Amino acid sequence: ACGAIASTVPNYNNAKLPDPFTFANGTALRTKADWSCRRAEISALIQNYEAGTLPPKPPVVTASFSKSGNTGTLAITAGLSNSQTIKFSPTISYPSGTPPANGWPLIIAYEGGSIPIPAGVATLTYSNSDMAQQNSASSRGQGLFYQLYGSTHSASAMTAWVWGVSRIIDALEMTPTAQINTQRIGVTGCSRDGKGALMAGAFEERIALTIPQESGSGGDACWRLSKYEIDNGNQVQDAVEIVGENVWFSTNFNNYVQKLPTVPEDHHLLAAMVAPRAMISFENTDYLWLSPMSSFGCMTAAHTVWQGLGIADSHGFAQVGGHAHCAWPSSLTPQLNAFINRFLLDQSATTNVFTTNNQFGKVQWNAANWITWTTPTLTGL
Ligand SMILES: O[C@@H]1[C@@H](O)[C@H](O[C@@H]2CO[C@@H](O)[C@H](O)[C@H]2O)OC[C@H]1O
Ligand SMILES: *[C@@H]1O[C@H](CO)[C@@H](O)[C@H](O)[C@H]1NC(C)=O
Ligand SMILES: *[C@H]1O[C@H](CO)[C@@H](O)[C@H](O)[C@@H]1O
Ligand SMILES: *[C@H]1O[C@H](CO)[C@@H](O)[C@H](O)[C@@H]1O
C-alpha cells in the first residue's frame, strides 16, 4: 500500500526538527490516510537509526489464564519457527464485581507505573526489565527477549519491551476469559519506564491511550533540542550520554549521537506515531536532567500532526514543577482522568490539555528556530 518503505536517508542533514508532513522521497502528505504510510516510514527510520529491529509476531504465541481472588495470571509462551521458546506471566489486578459487557478497560503499567489508576480500570503489571534488562551498558542483549531472538539481536531494550507488550495484547485477544475490553487498552510508565511506555504506544497500534510520565531524554524530549540545552549550560541528559548509560537504544545509535542533524527523525515523530490514537504525557521541570524545554518543544512539534489530522484534543501535554521525580501531583489528576475518562471509559470528557510553566532554565523555547513546517489540513476520513 505504501510502496517501498524508506529506512535510511543517507543525504539527510537538518539541524532543525524533521518535517512530519513530507515523506523521505519528497512527496507531501495530503490526506489523513497518508499518515498511515508516513507512520510506517517513521517506524522504519526509527528502527534503523536508534531502536533496532522490532520483530513481527512470531509463529507460536500461546496463552492460558487463571484467576485467584481479584488477580489474574496471563501465562504467555512465544516461539519461533526454529522451536525456540520463552515464557512470561504478567498479572492483572481487577475491579470487583460484574464487568462491563465488553470487559474491563485495562492499563498496561510498566512495573506498576506511577500514576493513580481509577477504580473501574484493570491494571496489568508488566515486568519489562525481565523482558530486557536495563541496569547499565552491561545489560546489552540480556533478558527474556534475547533468550528467544539471540543476545546479538539489534532490538534495543525498549524495542524488546514493545515486542512484549504486543505479545500481551495478542494473548488478551486470544483469551476472552480474561474479560478485558481489547479496544480499551492503555499503557503507562514513569522515568525509564516512561520512555518505554511512549515506545509501546507509538509502535503498537492496538493501544488506545498512551501515558508516559517524566520520561525525559529518550522519551518525550527531542534529541536536537536536548543538544541545544546541554550546549547552553542546562545539565540535561542528552543523546551522547544516554547511549553510554544504558541499553535503551540500539548499538547503531552510537554512530549518530554526535551527528544528530543527519538522523531523519526525532522523538516528535516518535510521539506522532501514536496518532490518530490518544496520548498525554506528563513532565516535571524540577529536574533539568529530564530536559524540560526539549519535551515542551518536542511535544509542541508532535502536536502539529494531531492538529493536521483534525484531532488536536487527542494529544495532551502537562508540564509542572514542585514535586519529586515520579511522585504524582494531585493538581494533575483532573488532566490524567480526562484522558482516561474519554479514551478508556467512553465518557464525554473534554481533553484540551497543553500546558507548561515555561521554567526551562538557561534556554527558552522559540518555535520558529525549530519548527519549519506549516501544518496542513489533511483531507478525507
Ligand atoms: O559496537 C557498535 C556496533 O555494534 C554498531 O554496529 C552497528 C549495528 O547496526 C548496524 O546497522 C550498523 O551497520 C552497525 O555499524 O556500530 C556502533 C558500535 O558502537
Ligand atoms: C513516496 O513514498 C511514500 C511512502 O513509501 C509512498 O507512499 C509514495 O507513493 C511515494 N511517492 C511516489 C511518487 O512514489
Ligand atoms: C532499513 O529498512 C528498509 C526496509 O524496512 C531497507 O530497505 C533498508 O535497506 C534498511 O535496511
Ligand atoms: C542510513 O542507514 C544506513 C545503514 O542502514 C547507512 O549506511 C546510511 O549511511 C544512512 O545513515
Author numbering: 80 to 460
Quote the study that presented this structure, word for word.
A common type of LCC in hardwood is the ester-LCC formed between α-1,2-linked 4-O-methyl-d-glucuronoyl moieties of acetylated glucuronoxylan and γ-alcohols in lignin. WT CuGE has a modular architecture with a N-terminal carbohydrate-binding module 1 (CBM1) domain connected to the catalytic domain by a proline-rich linker region. The overall fold of the catalytic domain of CuGE features a large ten-stranded twisted β-sheet flanked by α-helical elements and a surface-exposed active site. The structure complies with the characteristics of a serine esterase belonging to the α/β-hydrolase superfamily.
Through soaking experiments with ligands mimicking parts of the natural substrate it was possible to obtain high-resolution diffraction data for Δ*dWT and dΔS270A with ligands bound. Indeed, the structure of Um4XX-OH in complex with the active variant Δ*dWT shows continuous electron density, suggesting that a covalent acyl-enzyme intermediate has formed. The binding observed between ΔWT and Um4XX-OH (Kd 5 mM) can be interpreted as a measure of the binding affinity of the enzyme to the carbohydrate moiety of the reaction product.
